[PDB]
Design a protein around this ligand. Structure first.
Ligand SMILES: Cc1cc2nc3c(=O)[nH]c(=O)nc-3n(C[C@H](O)[C@H](O)[C@H](O)COP(=O)(O)OP(=O)(O)OC[C@H]3O[C@@H](n4cnc5c(N)ncnc54)[C@H](O)[C@@H]3O)c2cc1C
Length: 456
DNA sequence: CGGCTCGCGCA
DNA sequence: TGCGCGAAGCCGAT
């Protein structure tokens, strides 16, 4: 539908109907940003063709009760900066509270919407909201993949077994879908408070706050400043200062050599395509560039592939046949230790390395990538059953990780526990043929004592 | 049949 | 640290 720099393969039709005479409405759910947003740019293009203005709507659901203040304040403060950003472009932002299946449907009829566009997310609840919205509206409904460089329905048509199978498919379509982002043209036609929503939600999440012995909060919110402007600053410092040493020090939690982009990438405050755009043009270590590109392009977008083609991505059924048979055969094996969710959450295990990894999670909200595997694999080794291990790993991840409730999390948890996108290894006790990690193995790769002493 | 995102022994 | 090997099941290029 019109546009020169717009790839039609990024947008697909969810519902057909006669185009309305009112302004087009963009349902911002996953990509919370103004710049480098294909969904917002496409919505403006439809608005320009029909000589109507564009408007952005955000529906605040009750999902924040499951999570904590750390994700609520991160998302809410970014939205406050987002509201000012669209105001400079004469784009109004409307924030609702309630079920999207009824709030968005009512808003379309009340505002007399002409075209409805939303971003793409492979989550189960996102599809449920779309189906409820479709039955409640009679206007065209579109969906744009503004999160992945290559659209999820275009990269692959089936669930990918391993990364080596998905590697050639993604890199083959890169020269077409890797382009520059055109500027967002301001609106030509002009036509709840965000502070009150933050205050009300915080009070409802105060009892569930993670506290210390002296009733002191554990979360440290000064590590990551939320917002679109700060996300660019984090990416800028990574390329200039940390990209050169990424390829050799990304497995060292004692060194802050990671991009620290997941909290911004999860909420959509920065575009992964923009990050790839600047990294490809940077003169850095070729090994470091290849290692990082395989992380933000291959494994990041294969998590969407895993969740899109596997509705049970957070279940034992999603595990492949060889993993299920191995885990089932070792169900009756005696575990060395058995810890409950409360003991795992408090970091009260016999392993000081595991406790240190949990302490980093509770304090900063972003545990190091290498220690995340050992954090999740040891849960399986010290749990009643593989189903309980998956339950605890998901619960702790979605509650304390700033990048939690993301396809990158469920795929990562399934990789560590169920071996998704992995292969079989030496047969062992309890864990069976799932990939095994040991405390001594971490000793030969990084200074373990420094990591434990940093987080008690 | 070749190649895959651990621990382990050895410079 | 860095390198080669072991141990394991399976996709897919043919
Ligand atoms: C058990 C487990 C749970 C995880 N939980 C989450 C989660 O809740 N949310 C989340 O976004 N990521 C999660 N990860 C994936 C990964 O650990 C994080 O993306 C990364 O550690 C965040 O730090 P970083 O962005 O600075 O790392 P970087 O090395 O800078 O990563 C760059 C980017 O690449 C992507 N990426 C990196 N590693 C992975 C990976 N293993 N799988 C998929 N994409 C990746 C992310 O978008 C990340 O922002 C989890 C991994 C595991 C093993």
């Amino acid at each position: 539908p019109r546009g020169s720099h717009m790839n039609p393969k990024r947008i697909r039709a969810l519902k057909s109907g006669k185009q309305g005479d009112g302004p087009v409405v963009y349902w911002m759910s996953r990509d919370q940003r103004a710049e480098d947003n294909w969904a917002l740019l496409f919505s403006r293009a439809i608005a320009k063709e029909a000589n109507v203005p564009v408007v952005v709507v955000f529906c605040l659901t009750d999902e924040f009760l499951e999570a904590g203040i750390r994700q609520y304040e991160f998302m809410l403060k970014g939205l406050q900066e987002l509201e000012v950003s669209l105001s400079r472009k004469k784009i109004p932002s409307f924030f609702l509270r309630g079920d999207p299946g009824e709030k968005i449907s009512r808003f379309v009829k009340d505002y007399n919407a002409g075209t409805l566009v939303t971003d793409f997310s492979p989550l189960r609840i996102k599809n449920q909201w779309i189906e409820k919205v479709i039955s409640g509206i009679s206007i065209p409904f579109f969906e744009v993949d503004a999160h992945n460089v290559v659209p999820c329905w275009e990269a692959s048509q089936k669930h990918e077994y391993a990364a080596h199978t998905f590697r050639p498919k993604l890199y083959a379509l890169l020269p077409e879908f890797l382009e520059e982002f055109p500027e967002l043209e301001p609106n030509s036609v002009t036509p709840e408070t965000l502070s009150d929503v933050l205050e009300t939600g915080v009070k409802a999440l105060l009892p569930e706050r993670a506290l210390l012995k002296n009733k002191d909060p554990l979360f440290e919110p000064w590590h990551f400043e939320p917002g679109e402007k700060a996300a660019k600053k984090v990416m800028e410092s990574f390329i200039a200062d940390r990209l050169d040493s990424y390829g050799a020090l990304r497995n060292d939690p004692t060194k802050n050599m990671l991009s620290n982009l997941s909290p911004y990438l999860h909420f959509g405050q920065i575009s992964s395509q923009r990050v790839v755009l600047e990294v490809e043009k940077a003169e850095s270590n070729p090994g470091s560039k290849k290692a990082f590109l395989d992380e933000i392009l291959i494994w990041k977008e294969i998590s969407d592939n895993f969740c899109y083609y596997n509705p049970g991505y957070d279940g034992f059924e999603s595990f492949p046949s060889w993993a299920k048979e191995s885990l089932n055969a070792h169900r009756n094996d005696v575990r060395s230790h058995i810890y409950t969710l409360e003991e795992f959450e408090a970091g009260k295990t016999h392993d000081p390395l595991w406790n240190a990894s949990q302490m980093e999670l509770l304090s900063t909200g972003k545990m190091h990538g290498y220690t995340r595997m050992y954090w999740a694999k040891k849960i399986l080794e010290w749990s009643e059953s593989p189903e309980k291990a998956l339950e605890i790993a998901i619960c702790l991840n979605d509650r304390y990780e700033l990048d939690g409730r993301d396809p990158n999390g469920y795929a990562g948890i399934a990789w560590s526990i169920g071996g998704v996108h992995d292969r079989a290894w030496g047969e062992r006790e309890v864990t069976g043929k799932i990939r095994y990690m040991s405390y001594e193995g971490c000793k030969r790769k990084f200074d373990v004592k420094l990591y434990i002493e940093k987080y008690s």
